[PDB]
Amino acid sequence: DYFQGAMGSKPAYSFHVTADGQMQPVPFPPDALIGPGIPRHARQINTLNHGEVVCAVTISNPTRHVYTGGKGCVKVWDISHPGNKSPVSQLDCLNRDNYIRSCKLLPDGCTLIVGGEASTLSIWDLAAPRIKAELTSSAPACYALAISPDSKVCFSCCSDGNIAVWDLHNQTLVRQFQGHTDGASCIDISNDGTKLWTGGLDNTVRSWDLREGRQLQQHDFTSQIFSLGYCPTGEWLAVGMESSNVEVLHVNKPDKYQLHLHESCVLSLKFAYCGKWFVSTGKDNLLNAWRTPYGASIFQSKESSSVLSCDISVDDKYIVTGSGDKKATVYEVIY
Amino acid sequence: DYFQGAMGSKPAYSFHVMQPVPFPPDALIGPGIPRHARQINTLNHGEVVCAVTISNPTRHVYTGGKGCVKVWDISHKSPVSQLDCLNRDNYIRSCKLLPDGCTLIVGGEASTLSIWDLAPRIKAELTSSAPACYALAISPDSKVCFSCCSDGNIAVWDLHNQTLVRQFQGHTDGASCIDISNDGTKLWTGGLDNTVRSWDLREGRQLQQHDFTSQIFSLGYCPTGEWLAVGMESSNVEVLHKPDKYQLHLHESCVLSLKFAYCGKWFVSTGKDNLLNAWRTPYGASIFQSKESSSVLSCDISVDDKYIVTGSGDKKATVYEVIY
Ligand SMILES: [Ca+2]
């Protein structure tokens, strides 16, 4: 009621690419920009003044605290207390000169795993925050992390291209997926939890079988991959490119969609938990919300600087973004 | 060139009477609902275009400026013909074509309505005691022409006989706009006296009288019926049902003109604030907005709802192709 929808238009930006070289503008279905579970808009409700570029952001479950990863540390913010202007906690994880690149909360929300420009991954106990343990790898840096559905394993995208598989229980490296010839930049797990998908600076996206430990598919692109996400309801994989394109690949199938609403690198992306829509962030200061899988533009938010990272809450009610302007922004998704 | 929709949002601008309107699922999307209005032609009239009309079938556009109506062929950038007034200083305020398209009625700041034969020269002249004509309306049977006089009276002219048959008096100030209900038995008008009135095409006198704090500049009756949109000197647009109406706020200045799409599912309004706004019938969801270079004083929509033409303060008219 506070805000009302108003339709806009743009030159064709969403295309469907067939098996053969053939691009065609997508005819948006009746529920492309409106419908159950589809956001009407997003309202900025908080700004978290980290003071360093925020390369990683995560939100707690229940939603009350936001974790921002900057240089050397992760700051914890209590967003359930509007008046707060400073963090309630600060986790020193790496050298004050090294940047945090990824931080992930375990399914239960009692542990946080932090990785970045260093050979060690820190595991923090968030129970009534202290360093619980550390995972030391031979790779110089970690660019992204993923936690297995059963919370027993942590996958780490290494700067050397390898994907490390860590057994959290005994802090041991049980497996290593080799393939990427350049750093692995992003990762996600299929909805059935049997497959892993990674993106790399070697211009490839690779799928891996977790119960076997071998590469299944490989998609080669014209530019580097910086982000990706697997649709929670399956069938689709969204990929953010340095070329500025967002590619939504049809798992196993030929066809795909190509989305063009970023003028620069797509640094991060995340699917809503319902899978009906997703967001991408870019070096061009834009946060774009897209309908799954064809990419109808649901909403756009222009921030003050590059948007390097993002996360969405488990109930799809909040979006947090990390900024080149040394802060994080909290948005409430309005339906 | 292909275009695609992109959803946006704005602070509450549509109200039901003042409670924000809960836009239905088909408020901004649906068959017959525009997705984009593409500017395809600029008609350089040379004078402020206070009046515009489109032929049926769509082919020729007529723009009325100061002492001259120009004809443009949009089925193919300069005028294909033009109709000059005795005094090149007489500002034209309205021009309507008859169903066939071989006759154009021109009215304006003059004491005479000019009937032009487009099969071109003045076929006849209808002189009135009133100082000027601010708006014209043709009856469905195309045998009668209603003229809004600057004195407030509504002159009824028998086209074939070229004679004044009657008048509807009431407006303290000259009437500025008019339209006929979908049934064709009721007449609705608005005046510079800050009033909107309704008349009977049989009895001959006023029926309803509405209150407004500003001069009404435009009016439109929904083709499919049931609704009536009004534009005021203020900047508001209201869709009347009877009680229960809607109020729309997206103009920063006077609402100079308004026109319903023939399917009636949507309509447009123009303002001195350089905006062409498209609204969903009847609650007023914003379908699209176009910011022009100057004031938009007039508009028309083709009978096939495929084109919109606007008259501008920058001495030109703009042709838009409606993209569905
Ligand atoms: Ca681009």
From Swiss-Prot, chain A:
Consequence of substituting S280P = Abolishes HESX1 binding
| Coiled coil segments of this chain | none
Q: How is it modified after translation?
A: Phosphorylated, probably by CDK1. The degree of phosphorylation varies throughout the cell cycle, and is highest at the G2/M transition. Becomes hyperphosphorylated in response to cell differentiation and interaction with HES1 or RUNX1. Ubiquitinated by XIAP/BIRC4.
Q: Which domain of life is it from?
A: Eukaryota
Entry's localization field: Nucleus
Q: Changing V53S does what?
A: Abolishes HESX1 binding
- Each WD repeat occupies one of these ranges, namely 37-68, 95-125, 137-167, 179-209, 261-291, 302-332
**SUBUNIT field:** Homooligomer and heterooligomer with other family members. Binds RUNX1, RUNX3, FOXA2, KDM6A, UTY, histone H3, HESX1, ESRRG and the NF-kappa-B subunit RELA. Interacts with HES1 (via WRPW motif). Binds TCF7, LEF1, TCF7L1 and TCF7L2. Interacts with SIX3. Interacts with EFNB1. Interacts with TLE4. Interacts with FOXG1/BF-1; the interaction is inhibited by TLE6/GRG6.
Q: What is this protein called?
A: Transducin-like enhancer protein 1
Q: Entire protein: which part is shown?
A: 443 to 770 of 770
